[PDB]
Design an enzyme around this catalytic site. Structure first.
Site, PDB file in Angstrom:
ATOM      1  N   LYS A 193       0.826  -1.199   0.000  1.00 25.66           N
ATOM      2  CA  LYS A 193       0.000   0.000   0.000  1.00 25.66           C
ATOM      3  C   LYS A 193       0.869   1.261   0.000  1.00 25.66           C
ATOM      4  O   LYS A 193       1.836   1.368   0.759  1.00 25.66           O
ATOM      5  CB  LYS A 193      -0.910  -0.029   1.224  1.00 25.66           C
ATOM      6  N   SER A 252      -9.669   2.110   1.805  1.00 24.03           N
ATOM      7  CA  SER A 252      -8.528   2.791   1.195  1.00 24.03           C
ATOM      8  C   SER A 252      -7.527   1.877   0.469  1.00 24.03           C
ATOM      9  O   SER A 252      -6.677   2.366  -0.290  1.00 24.03           O
ATOM     10  CB  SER A 252      -7.783   3.631   2.251  1.00 24.03           C
ATOM     11  N   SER A 298     -10.553  -0.690   5.913  1.00 25.81           N
ATOM     12  CA  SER A 298      -9.725  -0.172   4.841  1.00 25.81           C
ATOM     13  C   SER A 298      -9.148  -1.264   3.969  1.00 25.81           C
ATOM     14  O   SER A 298      -8.840  -1.094   2.797  1.00 25.81           O
ATOM     15  CB  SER A 298      -8.538   0.674   5.335  1.00 25.81           C
TER      16      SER A 298
END
Length: 430
Positions: free
Chosen positions: A79, A154, A178
């Protein structure tokens, strides 16, 4: 080697046996990103020269009997919001467009020490604060199943990269869903770890009190492999999860929580959950109860979640005891991840964002409702992709268990792989 959609476990076996090398794998993944990443915008940093060098080293080490680490020679992306030494961590914000990390985030360092080959980073919404993945630095990430729809957020870039075979595994943070939500919308596996089982430091925004982290992958065994690499307890364990191998059970007792007053899910999810539960109930030694404790008022818990996002604490500690007794009676609790499947992009201000459930508009914050439970009580949660027809969008189910029962939820997902669901390759990809 050019075969696509091999698992990490298979890849490690093929590295050991010489059917492939790390250099061939790095070329495989960068080739797929060259062929497919432009319309998806999932990988937003690529470090080919560093990755190829690292792969050559892993290959030399393997040949000379000097390979070390449970991920040795395995490429991955991470990420964008985690620090990797020398790389930008922008978190999609203009203010940080040139913020370069000085050291690895501790969990990144732990992947590197297990021998992972970090090839790049995947897109996030700004400050990772949305359930979509878009920003002004890199653009919008599109759901590879339907590019007019969001993969969620996210960790949306990560989920798309895994589902496109740009990478066999991924690693991201999970605050209020997320990691779990993009897994659901995009058809991959995810595991949010128990609070305290692994460091989330070195994250931007980012030892945080509610955020945890964990892997994305295309099989339960690959999730377990990542947790072998990543686990470093920083709370005192109530028990030690065993990530050494799949532990199959003769008996499972499962609780479901698929709805609450004013919090209903779309009938399409309802039917696909029911079809899954029907198969689960038909297995020897399996009981499935619709037994969410009424002790936990969902509206009271939502108010706590809204606040976190001497009095609230009092209730929170009392609810945590209700959860411990729940998971002394049930192995796992199954819940939705979202009340809808993947939706068309909604980058208007939050207030005007709606989720259409059974034809009616619902609050965008239904994402928080169906993910607060694991967040608020520091619980492990594995998200498992259910079967899909070619005319259906992906749909995940959330497998929750007690604190530091991470092995239980991942083992439950691997048991489910024997029943229904698993990874499905999207049409048009390798």
């Amino acid at each position: 080697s050019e075969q696509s959609y091999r698992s990490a476990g298979t890849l490690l076996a093929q590295l050991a046996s010489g059917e492939t090398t790390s250099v061939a794998l790095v070329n495989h993944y960068f080739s797929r990103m060259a062929q497919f990443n432009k319309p998806l915008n999932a990988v937003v940093q690529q470090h080919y020269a560093l990755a190829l060098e690292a792969a050559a080293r892993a290959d030399r080490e393997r040949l000379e009997g000097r390979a070390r680490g449970v991920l040795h020679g395995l490429p991955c992306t991470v990420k964008e919001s985690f620090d990797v030494q020398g790389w930008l961590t922008t978190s999609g914000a203009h203010y940080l467009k040139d913020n370069r990390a000085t050291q690895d985030a501790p969990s990144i360092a732990r992947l590197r020490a297990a021998g992972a080959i970090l090839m790049g980073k995947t897109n996030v919404p700004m400050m990772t604060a949305d359930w979509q993945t878009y920003n002004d630095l890199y653009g919008t990430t599109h759901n590879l199943w339907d590019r007019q729809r969001s993969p969620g957020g996210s960790s949306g870039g990560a989920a798309v990269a895994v589902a496109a075979d740009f990478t066999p595994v991924e690693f991201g943070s999970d605050l209020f869903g997320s990691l779990r939500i993009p897994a659901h919308y995009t058809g991959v596996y995810a595991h949010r770890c128990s609070l305290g089982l692994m460091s989330v430091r070195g994250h931007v925004p980012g030892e945080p009190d509610l955020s945890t982290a964990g892997p994305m992958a295309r099989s339960a065994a690959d999730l377990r492999l990542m947790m072998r690499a990543l686990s470093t307890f920083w709370v005192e364990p109530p028990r030690i999860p065993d990530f050494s191998r799949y532990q199959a059970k003769a008996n499972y007792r499962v609780c479901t929580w698929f709805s609450a007053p004013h919090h209903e899910i779309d009938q399409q999810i309802a039917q696909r959950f029911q079809s899954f539960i029907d198969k689960l109930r038909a297995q020897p030694g399996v009981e499935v109860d619709d037994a969410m404790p009424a002790d936990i008022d969902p509206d009271a818990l939502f108010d706590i979640a809204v606040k976190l996002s001497r009095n609230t604490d009092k209730l929170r500690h009392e609810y945590s005891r209700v959860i411990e007794t729940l998971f002394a009676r049930y192995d796992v609790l199954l819940t939705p991840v979202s009340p809808v499947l993947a939706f068309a992009h909604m980058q208007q201000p939050v207030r005007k964002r709606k989720l259409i459930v059974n034809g009616e508009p619902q609050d965008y914050n239904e994402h928080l409702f169906w993910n607060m439970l694991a967040t608020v009580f520091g619980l492990p949660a594995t998200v498992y992709p259910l079967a899909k027809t070619m005319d259906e969008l992906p749909c995940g189910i959330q497998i929750i268990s007690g604190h530091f029962h991470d092995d239980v939820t991942i083992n439950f997902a691997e048991f489910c792989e024997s029943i229904s669901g698993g990874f499905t390759v999207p049409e048009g990809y390798g």
